[PDB]
Design a protein around this ligand. Structure first.
Ligand SMILES: CCNC1C(=O)C(=O)C1NC(COC(=O)NCCCCCC(=O)N[C@@H]1O[C@H](CO)[C@H](O)[C@H](O)[C@H]1O)COC(=O)NCCCCCC(=O)N[C@@H]1O[C@H](CO)[C@H](O)[C@H](O)[C@H]1O
Ligand SMILES: COC(=O)NCCCCCC(=O)N[C@@H]1O[C@H](CO)[C@H](O)[C@H](O)[C@H]1O
Ligand SMILES: COC(=O)NCCCCCC(=O)N[C@@H]1O[C@H](CO)[C@H](O)[C@H](O)[C@H]1O
Ligand SMILES: COC(=O)NCCCCCC(=O)N[C@@H]1O[C@H](CO)[C@H](O)[C@H](O)[C@H]1O
Ligand SMILES: CCNC1C(=O)C(=O)C1NC
Lengths: 103, 103, 103, 103, 103
């Protein structure tokens, strides 16, 4: 299995790594119908989403999407430094596939 | 997808943005039948609810309503500044649709 | 919907408000069969329970009872001041219906 | 209902109170098959388990077992003093039925 | 049942104990399809995974897999010392079976 987020990200099409090495600057979450999603930004302005669950997701990703939003909220609150994000770049904002945290 | 809470709010009828830039002053939660909801206030008296789940909501919103109540509780206990709330203004207290947190 | 815990409490029979304005002195939780409950106390000796889910509870209350125990746990560990409790005073210990936290 | 852990404990057979008045020294958790359990120890060497869910447990206990492991984890990480444990003493290590935290 | 992680680890084939006695250096999690997993590293370079739920796991392990990722995340964020990891060494990175935390 992948040793790290870079190797993981390279298993998928339409993905790229973002190297932030910074805490999350803003955390937004919505319960509005058809927009049950989270959005994060970094101080430089870069913005990322956790997509609404949809037909592009297999069933096993549903639990992981929920975990990711949990992760991002606690990371935000604790000011944890985000090392990298693996994202799908065929979406706007780019859609988070994975996160790594390291100080 | 929207890039921010103001753009997400504009996708819906009966909504408005409240810009708080302050921590939550009080957090109330109830398990009473037909009033399984949360209510928050800010120092200025502005009061908001997470609605009881009902026939207005679609299935995808159920998990999101639960997550929002989680978010408000931890925001309250950590003293996190709430930047904005997107709310439906056809309810009293105004009903939370989305929240943004920023330093 | 109610704007605050006092008005919420007044919608129900057999309830009262307790004003504590104090942190929780003790937190107790059990997984013993038929006693899957939580008990909290304050330094003045006031004792409250989160009832075991029963026939008095409607389906919508189930997730809220679980959330309440979550809330009491974290409130205890963070030493959060409890403002008021809305309780059913037709049970001993009085049974928690709602909680407000402020100050 | 019981007002405290000692009275609760006394409603069951094969139980005893252990008085710790101390934080948890170690926390261990496993996902290995048939050993999906938690183990905690105290600096006096006392060791306790949250048992693997089994045929002895009624349905209402399943959620409470999960909650207890959540509680022990957070108690460990926050260095919360454990007052007492109600345990079943017909298991080795003794099996937790209830926990009280104070002081 | 086992009283500690070493004894629990010994009950399984293809396992070994790693003694870290250190906080987690990095925490990675993914929601990408078929890679819904977590990876952790330590400053000595040691890398470990929580495997994707698969046909090697029994039902009872599914909740525990989810709990382990929760535990790792919060351990990382609180800089909790990890004492030992019980792992399967027939996977690369070695796959976490159990964790012990102690001061
Ligand atoms: C009802 C299913 N039984 C059991 C349990 O849940 C449990 O522990 C059960 N049985 C225990 C072990 O019993 C035996 O070893 N029995 C076999 C040997 C018996 C020799 C006698 C014999 O041959 N009798 C013959 O039996 C035949 C039928 O086979 C005929 O009837 C014939 O007529 C007769 O002569 C016994 O354990 C107890 O005494 N236990 C206390 C009660 C436990 C009830 C459930 C419970 O509350 N368990 C508790 O759950 C907690 C979690 O909620 C904790 O896990 C506690 O540790 C746990 O006790
Ligand atoms: C005996 O078991 C039951 O079915 N009781 C149900 C009768 C109808 C329930 C009426 C009711 O509102 N009970 C009330 O429920 C509350 C929980 O929601 C509290 O437990 C109050 O103490 C109880 O008076
Ligand atoms: C984790 O491994 C297990 O719990 N079980 C697998 C061990 C079984 C391998 C050896 C084997 O095939 N034993 C065979 O089991 C069969 C049932 O399946 C029959 O009882 C055979 O008589 C026995 O020789
Ligand atoms: C023994 O009987 C069972 O209940 N079997 C269920 C299937 C699992 C048997 C094979 C097995 O033990 N695989 C082992 O699973 C572990 C997870 O639990 C790890 O993935 C190990 O790398 C793998 O070798
Ligand atoms: C059939 C003999 N037994 C086994 C085998 O082959 C395995 O692998 C076994 N069990 C752990």
């Amino acid at each position: 299995t992948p040793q790290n987020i870079t190797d993981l990200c390279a298993e998928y099409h339409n993905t790229q790594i973002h190297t932030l090495n910074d805490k999350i600057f803003s955390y937004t979450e919505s319960l509005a119908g058809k927009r049950e999603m989270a959005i994060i930004t970094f101080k430089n302005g870069a913005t990322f989403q956790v997509e609404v669950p949809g037909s592009q997701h297999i069933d096993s990703q549903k639990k992981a999407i929920e975990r990711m939003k949990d992760t991002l909220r606690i990371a935000y609150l604790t000011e944890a430094k985000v090392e990298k994000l693996c994202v799908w770049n065929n979406k706007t904002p780019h859609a988070i596939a994975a996160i790594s945290m390291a100080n």
